[PDB]
Amino acid sequence: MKIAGIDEAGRGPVIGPMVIAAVVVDENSLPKLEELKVRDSKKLTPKRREKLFNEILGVLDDYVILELPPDVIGSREGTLNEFEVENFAKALNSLKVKPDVIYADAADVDEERFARELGERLNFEAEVVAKHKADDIFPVVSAASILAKVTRDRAVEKLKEEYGEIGSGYPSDPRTRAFLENYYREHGEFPPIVRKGWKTTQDMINKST
């Protein structure tokens, strides 16, 4: 069988793109992922993760990485379920090697619903197994988490070179609020890197509602 894993990176912050990676591995190659100890890579330095990233590509039958710019982030109703179900399926439907079983990270408190909704949006048939923070449970999902994290960290690093001190990207980060506030001050608008779903969603900065 062909097992696939899919996860995201950059869901919390409201600055920069969000990345969704989907990988596919033959069941007989699954072990190779654990031998690389992918599930325990969050502690690695960026360069060491960079190496792990390249190693992972060697065992996959196929994979897809989708870099979602902020201008398109916010296609849902409050709960970021619609946006992720829509894009997770998009990534999965883009694979050349169709998996039979797909393990997926579920942000929605109702894992079962997420798996079901995702499955009905596929252009192919496969069982879906969704779980909260699945990158710590399913090796295949962790592998995907890594391709996503590396891709996003590179994007962010690029953003810091262009705009400078942007903070962590969280609205609760004073440095990030300064960046946003100062930009709007000398531009009368928010920087293009701020996600659509927030600039209009309780953006309590220029609004101060």
From Swiss-Prot:
Coiled-coil features, chain-numbered ranges: none
Question: Which GO terms are recorded in the biological process aspect for this UniProt protein?
Answer: DNA replication, removal of RNA primer; mismatch repair
Its recorded reaction(s) are: Endonucleolytic cleavage to 5'-phosphomonoester
Fetch the SUPFAM superfamilies from UniProt. Ribonuclease H-like
InterPro entries per the record?
A: RNase_H2_suA, RNase_HII/HIII, RNase_HII/HIII_dom, RNase_HII_arc, RNase_HII_hlx-loop-hlx_cap_dom, RNaseH-like_sf, RNaseH_sf
Provide the E.C. number(s) assigned to this enzyme.
3.1.26.4
Per the record, the domain of life is: Archaea
Needed co-factor(s)? Mn(2+); Mg(2+)
RNase H type-2 domain spans which residues?
1-200
> Is this entry keyworded Cytoplasm?
yes
The top EC class is: hydrolase
Q: What keywords appear on the UniProt entry?
A: Cobalt, Cytoplasm, Endonuclease, Hydrolase, Magnesium, Metal-binding, Nuclease
Q: From the UniProt record, which GO molecular function terms apply?
A: manganese ion binding; RNA binding; RNA-DNA hybrid ribonuclease activity
The UniProt entry's GO CC annotations, sorted and at most eight, read:
cytoplasm; ribonuclease H2 complex
Pfam assignment, any one: RNase_HII
Cofactor info, note text = Manganese or magnesium. Binds 1 divalent metal ion per monomer in the absence of substrate. May bind a second metal ion after substrate binding.
Effect on the protein upon substituting residue 105 to A? Loss of activity
Q: What is its main location?
A: cytoplasm
What the entry lists under NCBIfam families is as follows: ribonuclease HII
Known function: Endonuclease that specifically degrades the RNA of RNA-DNA hybrids.
Q: How does it assemble?
A: Monomer.
Quote the PANTHER family the UniProt record gives. Answer: RIBONUCLEASE, RIBONUCLEASE H2 SUBUNIT A
Family statement drawn from the similarity comment of this UniProt entry: Belongs to the RNase HII family.
HAMAP family listed in its UniProt record = RNase_HII_A (MF_00052_A)
Q: What protein does this entry describe?
A: Ribonuclease HII
Query: Organism, per UniProt?
Result: Thermococcus kodakarensis (strain ATCC BAA-918 / JCM 12380 / KOD1) (Pyrococcus kodakaraensis (strain KOD1))
